[PDB]
């Protein structure tokens, strides 16, 4: 219950001239920690801190940058982790826990959720620091399956989610309106939800064109 | 513009010499028939008679257009002859474009190299060769009377392609609007 | 000498003209009305807002190449020189939009690009094609970094063909046209390989000569040749955070290298994952509803040995470019096969060619009545 | 069809079927392997139907369909009873 | 262009004809001089337009639209070329 409180000040800061000089790393950084604590997101608040760290490499913190990166991984597949990589210099990309979470983001965005949950520290300092991180990760796991998949196996969806069998499998199945299938699949989408042809419905190419041919 | 710069649009001279002010070629293709001229009331008196009980001849003409599209190549034979008007007129027009270039600059370029290679004449005597050379090619200024009807007949193709336009467009308009049953 | 003293003179002139346009473009409509009335040429006072802006963008990062850590010039440019011209009353001409373009020039140089929603929202002025070219040039980069290439590919084709109808004719660009043309070429070549065989977006902008060159490159990159990705990154890495040109390549000072590293380290990690995705999806969707035999046959091509064939294919399928499903009962891999059609590349040209007749009689019937 | 028309020829009549087709009398599917020779409806009605414009067919001429028939058949048929 | 307006007016006179013919017998004793004359020449409408109901004929004439647009398409490419040929003459 702190997001909309500081959102006004952050909105006023980001739509001004207070985002190029490293003098506003006392409000934006606290807003990144608020974003973490509430599971609500503002991208420019993170991007301003990243700019101030990139432009003058003298104020680059570890906790705040890691909160920025994890809050970018929660709101996938939005280009938040893009803008995270877009500023942090390779020298700063090899510090704890910036490098580890950059590797987590590399595995998440490419949809290597199995290798992510495996190589990831099952209990890290900042995964609990970001409220509903695990929720937001498994939402993004289920997002790509909801968009670009038809029918998943009982084990295969639990494998995609990571380190589950049936309990949290069914919790994430019944959440996104996914049914069961006979011996033995989880009904994600229909068998007609694959092809989705975008434009073979061309060449009604007369009516509105002959409006610019009458003369 | 024709009327001002006269006589008349002469070919080898007096062509570009009037295309300097540049005569307009197609201008005021005048309107034709708009008003009830009152040579009509008697034609209306035959119209009403043939719209009435004697409606055999009015419907004859209505029915007559049924077979102008049945067997005629309204598009195919026309776009054929107009395309062979393109290949003959427009392409020999382009050969005229290369040939007036074979003279004004191409030949002229080494007429210039004929003038320049002798230090532009001798101090004490002629200057025979310089005066003898630049023998002006038979086109000295665009050959712009072939090219007059040139423009007018490449625009004959324009109003012939505007023909071909309203042929295909409103025929296939009637197809995709009417058939769908 | 001959560089830094001239750079300082130029910067001072740009801050002077930034103050002059910051003062008399909020309340006053007297000097604006004087400038509309007395000097008949509308050219010069719209030229200044680009001529000064491009050399200021140059000189700022030129100085920053030395003052890398604790930089003055970018803070002097953005907050004082650009934002002072940005956040004001719009000059009712081609000045108001060019002030937003002058800020967006440095707003793109800095990789802090998110106000694309605001910059286009507050740009409610008549989008004259001169400004529209620079709009689709700068806004295009936001859509490129938005990782939505199916939408971003359409933007760069407008600026790269240059059918936008820009005719000035008073050196407005200025002095750097082939640089912007080559930059649009490289950004379009980057967008081409990321989606092929979906586009079918590379006929318009650059035609069959360089299309076949970048096409052979595009096939090599997708088949697994990393040399094409290397070329594509190397030719584009300056084009992201180049001002117009650096100061002077020296060996003694270590300052000039630090921004060049900042340019290299940023736009590599982004495009390396795109190059991997290009090879992941490379293989054409030959068949839709595959059985277990040649499912394992195409699992071989995806990634074999051995371990972790199934999970790796799953990872390669979850990339927003492979909609498929497994029927465990029947053992049936039901996949998509997304293809498109061509013929309607002759639809926007029929109007272009009607205006190409008008174009045929623009200059020539100008001559005609300057000749009579 | 070779039985339908018992002329002196079998071979030269078959290549007289195609000779008529190639030299623009009618429309047939010439040299089918299983030898099914359909005539179609109508697919190439331009000038090789009536060979060329003058018909070789007395009061048979069955319904083919093509251009402008749309407008003028629609108003002919309308106005016969009006 | 406006023979389409004439063809429209003709097709609506046919409609207003057919409507009163129906609705006159819809009440009682109408469509006397229409049943197998205007009805004979209502199936004579669908004799020539439409073609029975072939969606391969829809495909045929939208493929003809592709053809006919492309005939006038290069007609307009010649339109531009008329100016680029004979008006380079005017330099």
From TrEMBL, chain B:
> Where can this protein be found?
Cytoplasm
**Modified positions (Phosphoserine) in chain numbering:** 12
Q: Where is this region: Disordered?
A: 94-139
Where does this protein have compositionally biased stretches of type Low complexity?
99-118
**Cited function:** Component of the eukaryotic translation initiation factor 3 (eIF-3) complex, which is required for several steps in the initiation of protein synthesis. The eIF-3 complex associates with the 40S ribosome and facilitates the recruitment of eIF-1, eIF-1A, eIF-2:GTP:methionyl-tRNAi and eIF-5 to form the 43S pre-initiation complex (43S PIC). The eIF-3 complex stimulates mRNA recruitment to the 43S PIC and scanning of the mRNA for AUG recognition.
Q: Which family does it belong to?
A: Belongs to the eIF-3 subunit H family.
Quaternary organization: Component of the eukaryotic translation initiation factor 3 (eIF-3) complex, which is composed of 13 subunits: EIF3A, EIF3B, EIF3C, EIF3D, EIF3E, EIF3F, EIF3G, EIF3H, EIF3I, EIF3J, EIF3K, EIF3L and EIF3M. The eIF-3 complex appears to include 3 stable modules: module A is composed of EIF3A, EIF3B, EIF3G and EIF3I; module B is composed of EIF3F, EIF3H, and EIF3M; and module C is composed of EIF3C, EIF3D, EIF3E, EIF3K and EIF3L. EIF3C of module C binds EIF3B of module A and EIF3H of module B, thereby linking the three modules. EIF3J is a labile subunit that binds to the eIF-3 complex via EIF3B.
UniProt name for this protein? Eukaryotic translation initiation factor 3 subunit H
**Gene source species:** Oryctolagus cuniculus (Rabbit)
Per the UniProt record, the lineage of the source organism begins with: Eukaryota, Metazoa, Chordata, Craniata, Vertebrata
Automatic annotation (TrEMBL), chain C:
Q: Which UniProt keywords apply?
A: Cytoplasm, Initiation factor, Protein biosynthesis
Molecular function terms, GO-annotated: translation initiation factor activity
Indicate the segments forming the PCI domain, all copies.
Answer: 151-357
* Biological process (GO), any one: formation of cytoplasmic translation initiation complex
* Coiled coil residues, start to end: none
Q: Where in the cell is it found?
A: Cytoplasm
One cellular-component annotation, GO: nucleoplasm
- Its biological function? Component of the eukaryotic translation initiation factor 3 (eIF-3) complex, which is required for several steps in the initiation of protein synthesis. The eIF-3 complex associates with the 40S ribosome and facilitates the recruitment of eIF-1, eIF-1A, eIF-2:GTP:methionyl-tRNAi and eIF-5 to form the 43S pre-initiation complex (43S PIC). The eIF-3 complex stimulates mRNA recruitment to the 43S PIC and scanning of the mRNA for AUG recognition.
Which family does this protein fall into? Belongs to the eIF-3 subunit L family.
Any idea what this protein is called? Eukaryotic translation initiation factor 3 subunit L
> Organism source for this protein?
Oryctolagus cuniculus
Please indicate which part of the intact protein appears here, giving the first and last residue numbers and the full length: 224 to 595 of 607
Automatic annotation (TrEMBL), chain D:
**What domain of life does the native source organism fall in?**
Eukaryota
Q: What does this gene product do?
A: RNA-binding component of the eukaryotic translation initiation factor 3 (eIF-3) complex, which is required for several steps in the initiation of protein synthesis. The eIF-3 complex associates with the 40S ribosome and facilitates the recruitment of eIF-1, eIF-1A, eIF-2:GTP:methionyl-tRNAi and eIF-5 to form the 43S pre-initiation complex (43S PIC). The eIF-3 complex stimulates mRNA recruitment to the 43S PIC and scanning of the mRNA for AUG recognition.
Which family does the record claim for this protein?
A: Belongs to the eIF-3 subunit A family.
Summarize the subunit comment. Answer: Component of the eukaryotic translation initiation factor 3 (eIF-3) complex, which is composed of 13 subunits: EIF3A, EIF3B, EIF3C, EIF3D, EIF3E, EIF3F, EIF3G, EIF3H, EIF3I, EIF3J, EIF3K, EIF3L and EIF3M. The eIF-3 complex appears to include 3 stable modules: module A is composed of EIF3A, EIF3B, EIF3G and EIF3I; module B is composed of EIF3F, EIF3H, and EIF3M; and module C is composed of EIF3C, EIF3D, EIF3E, EIF3L and EIF3K. EIF3C of module C binds EIF3B of module A and EIF3H of module B, thereby linking the three modules. EIF3J is a labile subunit that binds to the eIF-3 complex via EIF3B.
What is the name of this protein?
Answer: Eukaryotic translation initiation factor 3 subunit A
Q: How is it modified after translation?
A: Phosphorylated. Phosphorylation is enhanced upon serum stimulation.
Tell me where the signal peptide lies.
none
Q: Where in the cell is it found?
A: Cytoplasm
TrEMBL record, chain E:
What post-translational modification does the entry describe? Phosphorylated. Phosphorylation is enhanced upon serum stimulation.
Q: Where in the cell is it found?
A: Cytoplasm
- Which family does the record claim for this protein? Belongs to the eIF-3 subunit F family.
Known role: Deubiquitinates activated NOTCH1, promoting its nuclear import, thereby acting as a positive regulator of Notch signaling.
Its quaternary organisation is:
Component of the eukaryotic translation initiation factor 3 (eIF-3) complex, which is composed of 13 subunits: EIF3A, EIF3B, EIF3C, EIF3D, EIF3E, EIF3F, EIF3G, EIF3H, EIF3I, EIF3J, EIF3K, EIF3L and EIF3M. The eIF-3 complex appears to include 3 stable modules: module A is composed of EIF3A, EIF3B, EIF3G and EIF3I; module B is composed of EIF3F, EIF3H, and EIF3M; and module C is composed of EIF3C, EIF3D, EIF3E, EIF3K and EIF3L. EIF3C of module C binds EIF3B of module A and EIF3H of module B, thereby linking the three modules. EIF3J is a labile subunit that binds to the eIF-3 complex via EIF3B.
Name of this chain's protein: Eukaryotic translation initiation factor 3 subunit F
Name its species: Oryctolagus cuniculus
Its taxonomic placement starts with:
Eukaryota, Metazoa, Chordata, Craniata, Vertebrata
Q: Which residues of the full protein are shown?
A: 274 to 364 of 364
């Amino acid at each position: 219950a702190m997001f909309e409180q500081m959102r006004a000040n952050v909105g006023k800061l980001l739509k001004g001239i207070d985002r190029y000089n490293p003098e506003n790393l006392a409000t934006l950084e606290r807003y990144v920690e608020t974003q973490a604590k509430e599971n609500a997101y503002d991208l420019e608040a993170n991007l301003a801190v990243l700019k101030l760290y990139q432009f003058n490499p003298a104020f680059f913190q570890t906790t705040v940058t890691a909160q920025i990166l994890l809050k970018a991984l929660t709101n996938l597949p939005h280009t938040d982790f893009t803008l995270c990589k877009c500023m942090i210099d390779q020298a700063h990309q090899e510090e704890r826990p910036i490098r580890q979470i950059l590797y987590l983001g590399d595995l998440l965005e490419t949809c290597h959720f199995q290798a992510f949950w495996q190589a990831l520290d099952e209990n890290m300092d900042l995964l609990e620091g970001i409220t509903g991180f695990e929720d937001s990760v498994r939402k993004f796991i289920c997002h790509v399956v909801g968009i670009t998949y038809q029918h998943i196996d009982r084990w295969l969806l639990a494998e995609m989610l990571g380190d589950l069998t049936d309990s949290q499998l069914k919790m994430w199945m019944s959440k996104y309106g996914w049914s069961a299938d006979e011996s033995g699949q989880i009904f994600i989408c229909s068998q007609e939800e694959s092809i989705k042809p975008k434009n073979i419905v061309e060449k009604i190419d007369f009516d509105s064109v002959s409006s610019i041919m009458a003369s | 513009k024709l009327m001002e710069v006269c006589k008349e649009k002469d070919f080898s001279p007096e062509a570009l010499k009037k295309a300097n002010i540049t005569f307009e070629h197609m201008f005021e293709e005048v309107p034709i028939v708009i008003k009830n001229s009152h040579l009509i009331n008697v034609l209306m008196w035959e119209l009403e008679k043939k719209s009435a009980v004697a409606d055999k001849h009015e419907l004859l003409s209505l029915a007559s257009s049924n077979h102008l599209g049945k067997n005629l190549q309204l598009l195919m034979d026309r776009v054929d002859e107009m395309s062979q008007d393109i290949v003959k007129y427009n392409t020999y027009m382009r050969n005229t474009s290369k040939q007036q270039q074979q003279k004004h600059q191409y030949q002229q370029r080494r007429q210039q190299e004929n003038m320049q290679r002798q230090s532009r004449g001798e101090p004490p005597l002629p200057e025979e060769d310089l005066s003898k050379l630049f023998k002006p090619p038979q086109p000295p200024a665009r050959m712009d009377s072939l090219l007059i009807a040139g423009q007018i007949n490449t625009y004959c193709q324009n109003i012939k392609e505007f023909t071909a336009q309203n042929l295909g467009k409103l025929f296939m308009a009637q197809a995709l609007q009417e058939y769908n049953n | 000498q001959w560089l830094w003293d001239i750079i300082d003179e130029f910067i001072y002139q740009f801050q002077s003209f930034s103050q002059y346009r910051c003062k008399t473009a909020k309340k006053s409509e007297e000097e604006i009305d004087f400038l509309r009335s007395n000097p008949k040429i509308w050219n010069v006072h719209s030229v200044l807002n680009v001529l000064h802006s491009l050399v200021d963008k140059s000189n700022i990062n030129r100085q920053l190449e030395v003052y890398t850590s604790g930089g003055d010039p970018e803070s002097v440019a953005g907050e004082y020189g650009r934002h002072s011209l940005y956040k004001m009353l719009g000059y009712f001409s081609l000045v108001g939009l060019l002030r937003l373009h002058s800020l967006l020039g440095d707003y793109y140089q800095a990789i802090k690009v998110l106000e694309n929603i605001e910059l286009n929202k507050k740009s409610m002025y008549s989008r004259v094609p001169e400004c529209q070219v620079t709009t689709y040039y700068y806004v295009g980069f936001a859509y490129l970094m938005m990782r939505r290439y199916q939408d971003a590919i359409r933007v760069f084709a407008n600026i790269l063909l240059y059918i936008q109808r820009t005719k000035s004719m008073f050196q407005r660009t200025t002095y750097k046209y082939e640089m912007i043309n080559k930059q649009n070429e490289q950004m379009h070549a980057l967008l081409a390989i990321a989606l092929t065989m979906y586009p079918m977006r590379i006929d318009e902008s650059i035609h069959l000569q360089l299309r076949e060159k970048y096409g052979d490159k595009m096939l090599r990159m997708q088949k697994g040749d990393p040399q094409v990705y290397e070329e594509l990154f190397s030719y584009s890495c300056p084009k992201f955070l180049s001002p117009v040109v650096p100061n002077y390549d020296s060996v003694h000072p270590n300052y000039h290298k630090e921004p060049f590293l900042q340019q290299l380290k940023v736009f590599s990690d982004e495009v390396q994952q795109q190059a991997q995705l290009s090879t992941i999806r490379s293989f054409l969707k030959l068949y839709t509803t595959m059985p277990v035999a040649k499912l394992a046959g195409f699992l071989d091509l995806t990634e074999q040995e051995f371990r972790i064939q199934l999970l790796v294919f799953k990872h390669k399928m979850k990339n927003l470019v492979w909609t498929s499903g497994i029927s465990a009962l029947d053992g049936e891999f039901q996949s998509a096969s997304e293809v498109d059609f061509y013929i309607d590349k002759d639809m926007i040209h029929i109007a272009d060619t009607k205006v190409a007749r008008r174009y045929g009689d623009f200059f020539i019937r100008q001559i005609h009545k300057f000749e009579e | 069809l070779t039985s339908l028309v018992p002329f002196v020829d079998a071979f030269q009549l078959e290549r007289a079927i195609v000779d008529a087709a190639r030299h623009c009398d009618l429309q047939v599917r010439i040299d089918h392997t299983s030898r099914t020779l359909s005539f179609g409806s109508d697919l190439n009605y331009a000038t090789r139907e009536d060979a060329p414009i003058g018909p070789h067919l007395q009061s048979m001429p069955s319904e083919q369909i093509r251009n402008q028939l749309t407008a003028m058949s629609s108003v002919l048929a309308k106005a016969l009873e009006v | 262009s406006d023979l389409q307006q004439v063809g429209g007016a003709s097709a609506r006179i046919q409609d207003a004809l057919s409507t009163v013919l129906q609705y006159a017998e819809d009440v009682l004793s109408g469509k006397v001089s229409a049943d197998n004359t205007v009805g004979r020449f209502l199936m004579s409408l669908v004799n020539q337009v439409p073609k029975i109901v072939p969606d391969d004929f829809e495909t045929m004439l939208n493929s003809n639209i592709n053809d006919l647009l492309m005939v006038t398409y290069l007609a307009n490419l010649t339109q531009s070329q008329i100016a680029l040929n004979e008006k380079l003459v005017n330099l």
